[PDB]
């Protein structure tokens, strides 16, 4: 849980690195890695459409299996637990018995050696994917499809999870990691367990460069700028917001709600963040 460092430099006092104990395999599965094209935050015009991105370590993308239902019934062995840099979770390598290899996102407690399976069958146990409708009420779950057959969407991120609170008609009620109370379709798949690598939220990056390794370039405050630039630019020495605090594009940034009010999915949500 979180290696610490004696303070033999500044910035090594508070630095904190992941515990890599769970990691079984130190190079990825070659048929399961494709290259990914670093955007640097730029769109297909050449334009930055997300600020303060770029640099940062090269990475190969591990292709991961977010539909488990195209293997219904076929069990698999957990061969390795691996480090995927494209996510906060860890990936578990699966050797299926018909010989296909796939990457699953690695649940908490899932240990190498275990057998895993997906379908309306299958024990309610860590790693097994099922349609939601067959999972007993109260179960914590992750990697949930939002609509049927469209792929795992909710609770993929290290440590997260989701809980079945009830059934209504063709739908089941989940409490999402955000605390939202959502309906989801009964046929949507989900695999049981939380995600694991829960310790992840406690790493302390500890210096500037470590942010830069992760591809995050420095972020400058509107206050640090001039009126051409930002609703907060200007003003002689410092100065407070001087107006309701805003984004570079002028819209207000404390409390102003941005979800489109007429969204069809509104019929399906019960709660908040």
Site for RNA in 84-143 (CB under 7 A): 84-89, 95-101
Question: Considering beta carbons, is residue 48 or 79 the nearer one to Mg ion?
Answer: 48
Q: 249 burial class (0-12, 13-18, 19+ CB within 10 angstroms)?
A: exposed
Smallest separation, CB 15 to RNA (Å): 6
Number of residues counted as binding RNA (CB under 7 A)? 145
47 near Mg ion, rule: CB under 5 A: no
23 near RNA, rule: CB under 7 A: yes
Tokens of 21: 């104990």
Residue linked to tokens 């334009």 = 47
270 near Mg ion, rule: CB under 5 A: no
Among 7, 85, 151, 242, binds Mg ion (CB under 5 A): 242
Smallest separation, CB 98 to RNA (Å): 3
16 near Mg ion, rule: CB under 5 A: yes
Among 114, 115, 139, 146, binds RNA (CB under 7 A): 146
Tokens of 194: 């939380």
Q: Provide the strand spans (E) within the chain.
A: 33-35, 60-62, 76-82, 91-96, 101-105, 115-116, 129-131, 140-142, 144-145, 152-154, 162-168, 171-175, 181-185, 189-192
21 near RNA, rule: CB under 7 A: no
Smallest separation, CB 128 to RNA (Å): 18
- Longest CA pairwise span in the chain (Å): 70
Beta bridge partners of 235: none
149 near RNA, rule: CB under 7 A: no
43 near Mg ion, rule: CB under 5 A: no
Which parts of 50-69 interact with RNA (CB under 7 A)?
A: 50-61, 63-64
Which parts of 176-235 interact with Mg ion (CB under 5 A)?
A: 202, 204, 216, 219, 221, 235
Smallest separation, CB 114 to RNA (Å): 13
Which parts of 195-254 interact with RNA (CB under 7 A)?
A: 197-211, 213-224, 227-228, 230-232, 234, 238-249, 251-254
Which DSSP state fits 9? S
* DSSP string computed for 189-211: EEEES----GGGGG----SHHHH
Q: How many CA atoms lie within 13 Å of 51's alpha carbon, on the beta-carbon side?
A: 8
Question: Considering beta carbons, is residue 130 or 140 the nearer one to RNA?
Answer: 140
CB of 90 closer than 8 Å to CB of 82: yes
Which of helix, strand or coil describes residue 264?
Answer: helix
Residue closest to 82 by CA, chosen among 98, 96, 95, 93: 93
7 near Mg ion, rule: CB under 5 A: no
Q: How many CB atoms lie within 10 A of CB 60?
A: 14
Give the span between the Cα atoms of 141 and 174, in whole angstroms.
9
Choose from Mg ion, RNA, none: what does 52 bind? Cβ within 5-8 Å by kind: RNA
42 near RNA, rule: CB under 7 A: yes
Smallest separation, CB 242 to RNA (Å): 5
Residues interacting with Mg ion, by CB under 5 A? 2, 16, 44, 202, 204, 216, 219, 221, 235, 237, 242
């Amino acid at each position: 849980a979180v290696k610490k460092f004696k303070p033999y430099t500044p910035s090594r006092r508070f630095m904190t690195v992941a515990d890599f104990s769970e990691i079984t395999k130190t190079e990825p599965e070659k048929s399961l890695v494709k290259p990914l094209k670093k955007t640097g935050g730029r769109n297909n015009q050449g334009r930055i459409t997300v600020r303060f991105r770029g640099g940062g370590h090269k990475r190969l993308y591990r292709i991961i299996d977010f539909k488990r239902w195209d293997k219904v019934g076929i069990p698999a062995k957990v061969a390795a637990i691996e480090y995927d840099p494209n996510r906060s979770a860890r990936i578990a390598l699966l050797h299926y018995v018909d010989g296909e290899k796939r990457y699953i996102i690695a649940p908490d407690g899932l240990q190498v050696g275990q057998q895993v399976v997906a379908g309306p069958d299958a024990p309610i146990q860590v790693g097994n994917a099922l349609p939601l409708r067959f999972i007993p009420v109260g179960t914590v779950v992750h990697a949930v499809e939002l609509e049927p057959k469209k792929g795992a969407k909710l609770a993929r991120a290290a440590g997260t999870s989701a809980q079945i609170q009830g059934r209504e008609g063709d739908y089941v009620i989940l409490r999402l990691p955000s605390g939202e109370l959502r309906k989801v379709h009964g046929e949507c798949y989900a695999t049981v367990g939380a995600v694991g690598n829960a310790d992840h939220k406690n790493i302390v990056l500890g210096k500037a460069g470590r942010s830069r390794w992760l591809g995050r370039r420095p972020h400058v405050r509107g206050a640090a700028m001039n009126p051409v630039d930002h609703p907060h630019g200007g003003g002689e020495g410092r100065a407070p917001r001087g107006r309701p605090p805003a984004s570079p594009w002028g819209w207000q940034t404390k409390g102003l709600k941005t979800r489109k009010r007429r969204k069809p999915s509104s019929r399906f949500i019960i709660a908040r963040r």
